[PDB]
């Protein structure tokens, strides 16, 4: 199917507690594969998936060099952001960046991404054309002008269409037994009386990969979107994910409710009901 690679960078200032901390993680789809933390005893880019371990010393040295340099650049960016927002040197602030590439089912670039945020709010984003920018405010317009003058978009386009896709395809091949394996959800419905005339039906999905899933409840074949409690999909810790959806229903009406599960690991969507056996 389709696949993606993404790097997520967080840089956080902390006046009075040293220089800003820089953390980077890299993912393929929903699988983390590298990390870097400037606060580590010995900061290095480190493997976090088995299929990246085979990369040689030139890989780990080069990624470590790049992440150390990125950490230094973010310390300057945090200082610049204070000037752009008229802010004092006393507060703690965060810059985040996410970038990478999406591949279609044919292995070709579907689209590229590079976006940044300041204090949790959109700051600037590379447009889908990989040639122009969208700035969120007048400060980010200063950055936009600087990056237009330095042809930053062209540099990003060359990475996103070249190395990003080439290395993603390499990771997908080296990690094919996991990255290219969907694990379908294990599903069941539980029933919990709330009172003598209502009960909760809870539709469970467990053990699935990747994380994208749809769970919906229908009553008499109609979606109960506004009456369903849906928890955020959550990691089990073994690479897989979990999710549930719940509805409160009138006692005696349970069989009018069906749970519908869609997931890439399923040949066809599943329909489940409470089975009072």
């Amino acid at each position: 199917g389709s696949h993606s690679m993404r790097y997520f960078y967080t840089a956080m200032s902390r006046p009075g507690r040293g220089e800003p901390r820089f953390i980077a993680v890299g993912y393929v789809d929903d699988t983390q594969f590298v990390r870097f933390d400037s606060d580590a005893a010995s900061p290095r880019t480190e493997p976090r998936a088995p299929w990246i371990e085979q990369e040689g010393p030139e890989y780990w040295d080069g990624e470590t060099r790049n992440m150390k340099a990125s950490a230094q650049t973010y310390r300057e960016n945090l200082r610049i952001a204070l000037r752009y927002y008229n802010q004092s040197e006393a507060g703690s602030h965060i810059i985040q960046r996410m970038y990478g590439c999406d591949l279609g089912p044919d292995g070709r670039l579907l689209r590229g991404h590079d976006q940044s945020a300041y204090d949790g709010k959109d700051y600037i984003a590379l447009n889908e054309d990989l040639s122009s920018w969208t700035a969120a405010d007048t400060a980010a317009q200063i950055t936009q002008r600087k990056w237009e003058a330095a042809r930053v978009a062209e540099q990003l386009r060359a990475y996103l269409e070249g190395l990003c896709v080439e290395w993603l395809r390499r990771y997908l091949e080296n990690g094919k037994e996991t990255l290219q394996r969907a694990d379908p959800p294990k599903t069941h419905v539980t029933h919990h009386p709330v009172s003598d005339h209502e009960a909760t039906l809870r539709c469970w999905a467990l053990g699935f990969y990747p994380a994208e899933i749809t769970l919906t409840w229908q009553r008499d074949g109609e979606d109960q979107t506004q009456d369903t409690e849906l928890v955020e999909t959550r990691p089990a810790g073994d690479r897989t994910f979990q999710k549930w959806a719940a509805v409160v229903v009138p006692s005696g009406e349970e069989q009018r409710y069906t749970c519908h599960v869609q997931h890439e690991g399923l040949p066809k969507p599943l329909t489940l009901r409470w089975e009072p056996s």
């Binding site: 960016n77 970038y99 600087k146």
Partner: peptide, 8 residues
């Protein structure tokens, strides 16, 4: 593989 950072 990662890419480079830019000064804002």
């Amino acid at each position: 593989v990662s890419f480079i950072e830019f000064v804002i």
